[PDB]
Every structure is written in structure tokens, then in C-alpha cells.
Design a protein around this motif. Structure first.
Motif: not given
Lengths: 154, 257, 372, 208
Positions: D175-199
Motif C-alpha cells: 500500500x501507498x499513501x501520502x500526507x500532503x506534507x508531501x511525505x509518502x508512507x507505504x507498507x510492504x507485506x512486511x508488517x505495518x509501516x515504512x516512509x519514503x523520502x525523495x529529498x
């Protein structure tokens, strides 16, 4: 049925004329067809007059358009002109009714009556002018009537 | 001539003064050298003075006199010119609408992009409308419509088939939508005399671009259906008012193939 | 959203189709455990319902509590929608739930358009009635494997329209004033059948004969409130905002407002006789005032229509002096209820300078003469 | 007394009333039981029906044709801001105009199966802050970020790779979702949570 009716105007057939005549009284289309059909002015006018006078609901604007058309084609004339005059009065009365604030929208019935047909002058006078105090209309109406009595006029 | 007439005043006194005025008036009339004698072009900035104006005074009354005369003769252009000086802005546009209005209806192959009644039309609009415009809204409206129709002409032919439809639709004169063709009937008789006349070409311009653009294509999304429905509505429209039109439903020729 | 409700953070939809609402309380760094504020049950009719059973994940809630339920029966797929009736919601709560046409599997739902919510506060958030004009029509997407389905929300105008023949029902739920307002809009509304317009005009003018009467009672009649509500709602966005920054609003918008008010102006002008001409007198005064107001707004908008044409910006910059601070914080309502002297000076400059072209210029001079 | 001021006052008062309107949800409202106007039947609520179905648009066959062969995986959805629909079959992705349908865009960039797609807002301050929306696409191996925009000339759709690849081989990003901070949070089939940063870097929020 096909609404081929416009094509009907074109048909030359000698049978056609009686067809229109008999059918003449969505017949209105037949008549719109008929006056148009008559190249002759006299015949055309006679029909539109009847069109205006007719008892099916046709708006006054159209009733007048018929007269405007019929008049253009100009004793028949006598009847036509008087008609135009009386019709005009209703238009005026109708217009005032809108402005008047004494009126209720639901008593739309009056407008329906006005647009619906030509009315008796007395009917117009007694029913409309006096109760709605349209003095101007009353005056104009009596003009057409040609009511001379100075006291009443004054 | 003006310089010489002016000397007449040298004999100071009435009579002579009027003689001078009459002479000038007589000069303007029949010489018809309006620009030179009376003045020219506003660009705001009122008149650019004519030779007489430099001398000055009764100049407005002479203009009305000349202008009315222009009207008799039908020397349109002179009248428009005269009224501009008169500063009868409303009158100018109205005469102007008439001039542009006819010459619009007619037959095609004209309108270079640089000078004439159309060009005249452009001058006045740019010129007056921005500035504290004294004209009637109605008068201006027809004016803009005539200009829009003209731009449609420029682009009609010289290619740009697609652009022509867009502009014609903008006019809001001709039914592009549904069978609302009839509403176009109701609003037709209402139309001002100037436009009522022009419609003939509006139609047939539409069925043309509509035809050429919708040339059956070679070998994907191709919505031929529209630009087809448009012709249909237009034809119903044309069908309803042929009598109130010049008499060329030869839309039919272009319509088919 | 907190805007919708400060307290309620989340809504959970169960397979059963039950809706659970939880409240929370955040801080700058700490969340609060959620609590179950409220629960709603599916209408089988009422509570024990298995109508919603089973309910798929596809189901979603549309901003301002509009529920789209995808139900997959163990026989087939059914779609339901629940919309709160905002109108009766101006105190009691009621939800209108109906079955929907879609029969296929429903892959995903989305809102094509912004949400209709009027305010960004829990207060008046839900008033659809207020933002019926301004807010874009709500359109909803239902994606199925086979195709996309589009659903449209029905505005109160449409509801009244259905009711045109009996409008008591509208009256009952919505109230008399609102009925009058909608009635006015239908009358004015363009592309409408004559029957509809006439009927709505009749209702507005006369109400229902020997039924609902239209009147000032020793307060003002519904007619006045209805007209005023109409006027207020159209103008609501612009009303408080500052006119000049360039103009705050775009030309297209100016034309839109001008056109709309023009229709109203003509309407009232035409049927002014009925309204004008003590409760009765008070009604007369109030209506007179409103009509004058509509015309006045027409005038201001008209001037702006003028200004849009050209070279407004340059003059503005050069012209503004000490008075300027006052000018810049001028709201549209300020123009609506005019600040005459500044405009007169500005208009004079528009004419004196070249900016106004042709017909426009004539119009201002006319304006200065008439009301200046 | 003056009518003009008077009228203004009336509207303002009414406006205030409109704004004050009661909060949409209150527990008290349906504490006993919910009032429901509920018909099983379509158009059962004649006058009242909240929604009507204006139109149905089928997926264009042209689009469907390039979905004909799909061994592994299918999925589709609608992008709310775009007013476009997307279809994913295996590696390829389609975007099609809601209003048109003829107009469709195709991604040829992706080499591998597409696990998930999402529409997200750009960060407050990156080189592409300007773009209206970003399209995140996750495959087994990588996460790609592209920019979506509308041509002002054609009014067509413009997709440009904003070459940003994030290796996320192990993740199987569900799954992928975002906060309009521009932060993107996604989850793998690896438990609950992870967050990506493009800079590109992945950082687990929920601690590794």
C-alpha cells in the motif's frame, strides 16, 4: 403521423385541397399548413383569423402573430382589425397584471384567461378594468367601443 | 483658400464676419475636404485640428450641416468621419454597424487584412470602447458581434477549418447543441436588423468547415458524430427560417456529397 | 476532518455494514486513545438488519457523511447510498437511504468533485442549502470491472422540481422560507419548461391556494426571507472579500455574477408591483430595500465588468494616495453598499484617461450623471 | 432606516444563521436508533432520492485490448484529482480520460510487474514542487516517481519520469499513501509501516 406534414404542402394533388379543408377543424399544424398552403392572400387570411378566434389553447402572442400575418395579407378586414385592437388590450392588461402587486401568482387563472382568447368588451371592462382599477385600460377600451357618454368618460 | 477667406475678417464688423463664415462654410461644403478643413482622428486626444480650427469657433454647427448632407448623398464614411468630429459617438457606431453589417452578407473573396470598413470597424472599437464609452451597450454589442463574425471570415478560408467552428459557436447565434434549433428560432425574430441579415452566411460557413473538416478520413478515437450533429441542428435551423432568409437553402449542396 | 467534526477522528465500517465513530484528542507529541463515540446500524429496516451483510471494502464515506455501501450478498451485489437529509438536519438528524442501479461488482468508489461542505468549521459545515449555488455539482464515481458509473447528487432545486405539482412535502421538511427561495430560483432558472417556471412563480407569489398562505404576521413573510436567502447565498463567497488587491475576482466570475444578478434584477423589476405598495407595510419596506439592493449590486458589478476590459491596473497604481489604505481594504459589500466618492473620482479618471473605449466611456458618463 | 443599509443587515444576519447551522454528527442524534428513510427499491424515494445515475461509460475496447494478455496480476482504479482511470495488467499501466475515453496514456517505462500505483502531492520544496501531482508506481524491484500535468496547448496529459529509483526488492509494497506534507508512507507485506523520502532512501518508522 410521420410528421411528413411539411411535405404535404408540396403535394399538388387535387385531392389534397379537400383533405386540408375537411381536416381543418394537432390540427393546428394542418392549419399552419393551410394558410401557408394558400398562396392566395384572401384565403390565407381567412384561416389565420379563424386560427386566432379558435376555441385550442394558443398563446395570444401567437394569436396576434396570426393576426399580424392575416392583416399583412390585407368586411373580413373589418373583423380582423377589431380583433387586433381587442387582443392588444388584453396584452396591455396582461402586462399590467404582472406589475401590479395586488395580484397573487396562484391566481394565474386570469392570465390563462387573457392569453386564452378574445373576450367580451364588457367582460374585459367590468371584470378586469374596474376590479383592477386599470383606468387607462378602461379608457382605451371605451375608445374602441366608441362610448360617447361624456359623464361616464369624464 | 482658407488663408484668403480669413482676410475677410480684416474688415472688422458684423456682416463681413458672417460673410467670412458663410464663405468658409461654403468652402467646406462642395470641396468636401473635410480632413484638411475640419480635422481628423482622435486617438483620444480630441481632434487634431484642421486648418480652419486653427482659426477657430463655429465648427461644430458646420459639421452637423455637412454631415447631414453626407447623409442625403449617402456618402457614408464622410458621415462617419463627420460624426466623429461632432463627437456623436453613439451615432458613429450605429452608422458604422450598418456599414459593416452589409458587406458582411454577400458573396466571398475579399477582405485583405489591411484597410476598409472592417478596418474602420476595428479602429473605432479599440478607440472608443476603452475610453469612457458614451455609446449604448446595445449598439456596442452588435458592434462586437460584427467584428467577431469578421474575424471568423479572416480565418474562414486561409485554412483553419477547426478554428472557424470554435468561433462561430462562440457567437451563440447558431445551435451547436441539441435540437435547441427552435430556441434559435424564438431568438431570431428578436435579433437586431443588422444581424438578422448576416445569418445567411453564418449558416453555410458552418456547413463547409463542417464538410471539409469532416472529409471522410483514411484509415483510435474519431468522433465524427459531432461536427455531424452540428450540421443536423443547423439544417433544422435553416429549414425553419428559409422564408425569412434570402432564399438559398443550397446548404443542401454543400450538405451532401 | 476536524473541520467536519472537531472530536471525531475516524469512522469504521464493518462487514456487517455497521458504522462506528471514534473521538480522539491530539497534542503537539502524543495521541490519545480513540473512544467509541457512536454507532449506526444498517437499515434492514432497523437494527438487526442483515441487509448490509455482507459489506465490502469498496464501501467508502464521502466527505459530509455520505455513505456508499457495496454489499455482496452471499445472491448478488447490491449498492446502497445514504445521504443525511441536511435540510431537516437543521436540528434533527435523518438519513435518506436508497438502493442504486449498479448491479455489477463494485471495484472502487471515488468523488470526482470538491466536497459540497459549506464551511471549514463544524458549524455550517454540512449546510448544502447554503452552498447549493456555489459548490460545484457533486458527482460520484463507481468503478466496476466492466465500466464506470457516474452518479449525481440531487440538489434541493431538483427536489422541488419533482414536487412542483405537491410542494407541501418540501415545505414540511425544508420549511416555508426555503421553499420560497427554491421557488424563486426555479422561476428564474434557465431551459426550464414554462409549466415549471409558472408553477414556481405561482407558488412564490401566491403559495398554495386555500392551503399554505404566503405572510407577514405580527415577522416578515417567507417571500422576503426566501428572496434574501437567495441573494445572500449567491454573493456569500465574494461578499466579505476585498475587491482590489488587480481585482480579486476574475473576469469570468464577474460576468457570471453580473449575469445572475441581472436575471434577478429583471425578475424583481417586473414583478415589483406585487411585492411593494404594520405587517403589510413592513413587508413592503423590506422588499423595497432588497430590490434596491439587488439593483445596486448590479450597478457595482456593471462597473467592474467595465473595468475588466482594459488598462485598469496602470491607473490604479498611479492614482492611489493616502486614501489608498482605505481603498485596498474595501470589500464587495462595501461596493454593494457604496463608498461613492472614491469611485466617482476613479471613474472620472477612467474616462479622462484613454482607458475606456467607445461605448464603455459613454456609459460611465451616463453613470456619473445618473448616480453621481 | 435606509433601505440599503437595511438590506445589507438582513443578508448579513441570514448569512450568520447559515454559518451557525448545527454540526453534522452528534451522538445524541441517534443515541435511540437511526431516523431512516430507507427504501430497498431504485427511485423508491421518489422526490427525495439523493443520487441518480447519470451515465455509464464502458472501458474502451482499445484500452481493453492492451489488457488482453495478463498472466500474473490485474488491478484498476480511479484517480480522483486527474478524473482519469488507471488499469494495471502485469508490467504495463494505462491511464484513460474519464470524459474522453479515446485519450489514453501508456507507460512503457516499467520493466516489471506493478504492485501498486498511487497519486500523491509533491513536497513543499523539491525541484518538482510545481507539478500538480506525482504518480508513484511500485513494482517488485523498484518504486518510480513520475510527474503528471496537463498541457495547457493540447490539454493532453504529460507524464515525465522524475528519475527517482528506489530499490524496494524485499518489500512487496502493498500500500501507498501520502500526507500532503508531501511525505509518502507505504507498507510492504512486511508488517505495518515504512516512509519514503525523495529529498531514495527507505526508513522504517515503526523501527526496524
Amino acid at each position: 403521423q410521420v410528421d411528413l406534414a411539411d411535405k404535404l404542402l408540396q403535394v399538388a394533388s387535387p385531392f389534397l385541397e379537400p383533405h386540408l379543408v375537411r381536416m381543418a377543424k394537432r390540427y393546428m399544424d394542418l392549419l399552419w399548413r393551410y394558410y401557408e398552403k394558400n398562396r392566395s392572400f384572401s384565403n390565407a387570411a381567412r384561416v389565420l383569423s379563424r386560427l386566432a378566434d379558435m376555441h385550442t389553447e394558443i398563446s395570444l402572442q401567437q394569436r396576434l402573430e396570426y393576426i399580424a400575418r392575416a392583416i399583412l395579407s390585407a368586411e373580413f378586414l373589418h373583423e380582423l382589425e377589431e380583433k387586433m385592437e381587442v387582443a392588444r388590450i388584453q396584452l396591455q392588461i396582461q402586462e399590467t397584471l404582472q406589475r401590479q402587486y395586488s395580484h397573487h401568482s396562484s391566481v394565474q387563472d386570469a392570465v390563462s384567461q387573457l392569453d386564452s382568447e378574445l373576450m367580451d368588451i364588457t367582460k374585459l371592462y367590468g371584470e378586469f378594468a374596474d376590479p383592477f382599477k386599470l383606468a387607462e385600460c378602461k379608457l382605451a377600451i371605451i375608445h374602441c367601443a366608441g362610448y360617447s357618454d361624456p359623464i361616464l368618460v369624464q | 483658400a482658407l488663408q484668403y477667406f480669413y482676410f475677410l475678417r480684416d474688415e472688422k464688423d458684423s456682416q463681413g464676419e458672417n460673410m467670412f463664415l458663410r464663405c468658409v462654410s461654403e468652402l467646406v461644403i462642395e470641396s468636401r475636404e473635410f480632413d484638411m478643413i475640419l480635422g481628423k482622428l482622435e486617438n483620444d486626444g480630441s481632434r487634431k485640428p484642421g486648418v480652419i480650427d486653427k482659426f477657430t469657433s463655429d465648427t461644430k454647427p458646420i459639421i452637423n450641416k455637412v454631415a447631414s448632407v453626407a447623409e442625403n448623398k449617402g456618402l457614408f464614411e464622410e458621415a462617419a468621419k463627420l460624426y466623429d468630429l461632432a463627437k456623436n459617438a453613439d451615432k458613429v457606431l450605429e452608422l458604422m454597424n450598418k456599414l459593416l453589417s452589409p458587406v458582411v452578407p454577400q458573396i466571398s473573396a475579399p477582405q485583405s487584412n489591411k484597410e476598409r470598413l472592417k478596418n474602420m470597424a476595428l479602429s473605432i472599437a479599440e478607440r472608443y470602447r476603452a475610453q469612457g464609452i458614451s455609446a449604448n451597450k446595445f449598439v456596442d454589442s452588435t458592434f462586437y458581434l460584427l467584428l467577431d463574425l469578421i474575424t471568423f471570415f479572416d480565418e474562414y478560408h486561409s485554412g483553419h477549418i477547426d478554428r472557424a467552428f470554435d468561433i462561430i459557436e462562440r457567437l451563440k447565434l447558431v445551435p451547436l447543441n441539441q435540437e435547441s434549433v427552435e430556441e434559435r428560432v424564438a431568438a431570431f425574430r428578436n435579433f437586431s436588423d443588422e444581424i438578422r441579415h448576416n445569418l445567411s452566411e453564418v449558416l453555410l460557413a458552418t456547413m463547409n468547415i463542417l464538410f471539409t473538416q469532416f472529409k471522410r478520413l483514411k484509415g483510435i478515437e474519431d468522433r465524427d458524430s459531432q461536427l455531424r450533429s452540428q450540421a443536423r441542428t443547423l439544417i433544422t435551423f435553416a429549414g425553419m427560417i428559409p422564408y425569412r432568409t434570402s432564399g438559398d437553402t443550397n446548404a443542401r449542396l454543400v450538405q451532401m456529397e | 476532518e476536524n473541520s467536519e467534526s472537531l472530536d471525531c477522528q475516524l469512522l469504521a465500517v464493518t462487514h456487517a455494514g455497521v458504522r462506528l465513530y471514534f473521538s480522539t484528542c491530539p497534542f503537539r507529541a502524543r495521541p490519545n486513545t480513540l473512544t467509541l463515540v457512536h454507532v449506526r446500524l444498517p437499515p434492514g429496516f432497523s437494527a438487526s438488519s442483515t441487509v448490509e451483510k455482507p459489506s465490502k471494502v469498496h464501501r467508502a464515506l464521502y466527505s459530509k457523511g455520505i455513505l456508499l455501501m457495496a454489499a455482496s450478498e452471499n445472491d448478488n451485489d447490491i449498492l446502497w447510498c445514504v445521504n443525511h437529509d441536511t435540510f431537516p438536519f437543521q436540528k434533527p438528524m435523518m438519513e435518506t437511504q436508497m438502493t442504486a442501479g449498479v448491479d455489477g461488482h463494485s471495484w472502487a468508489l471515488s468523488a470526482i468533485d470538491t466536497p459540497l461542505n459549506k464551511d471549514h468549521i463544524p458549524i455550517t459545515d454540512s449546510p448544502v442549502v447554503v452552498q447549493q449555488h456555489m459548490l460545484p455539482p457533486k458527482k460520484f464515481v463507481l468503478l466496476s470491472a466492466q465500466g464506470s458509473l457516474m452518479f449525481h447528487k440531487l440538489r434541493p432545486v431538483d427536489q422541488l422540481r419533482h414536487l412542483l405539482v405537491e410542494i407541501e412535502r418540501f415545505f414540511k421538511l425544508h420549511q416555508e422560507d426555503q421553499a420560497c427561495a427554491t421557488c424563486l430560483i426555479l422561476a428564474c432558472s434557465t431551459c426550464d419548461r414554462e409549466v415549471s417556471a409558472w408553477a414556481t412563480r405561482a407558488f412564490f407569489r401566491y403559495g398554495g391556494e386555500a392551503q399554505m398562505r404566503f405572510t407577514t404576521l405580527p415577522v416578515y413573510s417567507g417571500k422576503h426571507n426566501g428572496i434574501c436567502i437567495y441573494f445572500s447565498r449567491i454573493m456569500g463567497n465574494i461578499w466579505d472579500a476585498s475587491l482590489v488587491v488587480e481585482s480579486s475576482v476574475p473576469c469570468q466570475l464577474l460576468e457570471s455574477v453580473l449575469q445572475e444578478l441581472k436575471g434577478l434584477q429583471e425578475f424583481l423589476d417586473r414583478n415589483s408591483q406585487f411585492a411593494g405598495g404594520e405587517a403589510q407595510l413592513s413587508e413592503k419596506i423590506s422588499l423595497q430595500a432588497i430590490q434596491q439592493l439587488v439593483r445596486k449590486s448590479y450597478q457595482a458589478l456593471a462597473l467592474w465588468k467595465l473595468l475588466c476590459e482594459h488598462q485598469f491596473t496602470i491607473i490604479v497604481a498611479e492614482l492611489q494616495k493616502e486614501l489608498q489604505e482605505q481603498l485596498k481594504i474595501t470589500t464587495f459589500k462595501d461596493l454593494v453598499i457604496r463608498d461613492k466618492e472614491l469611485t466617482g473620482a476613479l471613474i472620472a479618471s477612467l474616462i479622462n484617461c484613454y482607458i475606456r473605449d467607445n461605448a464603455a466611456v459613454d456609459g460611465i458618463s451616463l453613470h456619473l450623471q445618473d448616480i453621481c | 432606516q435606509e433601505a440599503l443599509e437595511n438590506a445589507g443587515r438582513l443578508i448579513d444576519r441570514q448569512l450568520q444563521e447559515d454559518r451557525m447551522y448545527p454540526d453534522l454528527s452528534e451522538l445524541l442524534m441517534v443515541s435511540s436508533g437511526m431516523d431512516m428513510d430507507y427504501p430497498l427499491q431504485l427511485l423508491s424515494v421518489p422526490n427525495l432520492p439523493e443520487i441518480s445515475s447519470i451515465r455509464r461509460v464502458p472501458l474502451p475496447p482499445e484500452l481493453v485490448e492492451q489488457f488482453g494478455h495478463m498472466q500474473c496480476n490485474c488491478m484498476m482504479g480511479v484517480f480522483p484529482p486527474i478524473s482519469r482511470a488507471w488499469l494495471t495488467i502485469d508490467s504495463d499501466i494505462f491511464m484513460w480520460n474519464y470524459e474522453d475515453g479515446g485519450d489514453l496514456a501508456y507507460f512503457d517505462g516499467l520493466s516489471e510487474t506493478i504492485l501498486a500505483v498511487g497519486l500523491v502531492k509533491p513536497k513543499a520544496g523539491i525541484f518538482q514542487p510545481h507539478v500538480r501531482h506525482l504518480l508513484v508506481l511500485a513494482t517488485p524491484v523498484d518504486i518510480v516517481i513520475l510527474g503528471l500535468s496537463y498541457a495547457n496547448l493540447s490539454g493532453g496529459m504529460q507524464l515525465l519520469p522524475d528519475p527517482l529509483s528506489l530499490p524496494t526488492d524485499n518489500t512487496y509494497l502493498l500500500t501507498i499513501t501520502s500526507t500532503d506534507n508531501g511525505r509518502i508512507f507505504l507498507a510492504g507485506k512486511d508488517g505495518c509501516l515504512y516512509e519514503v523520502a525523495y529529498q531514495k532512501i527507505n526508513h522504517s518508522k515503526s523501527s526496524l
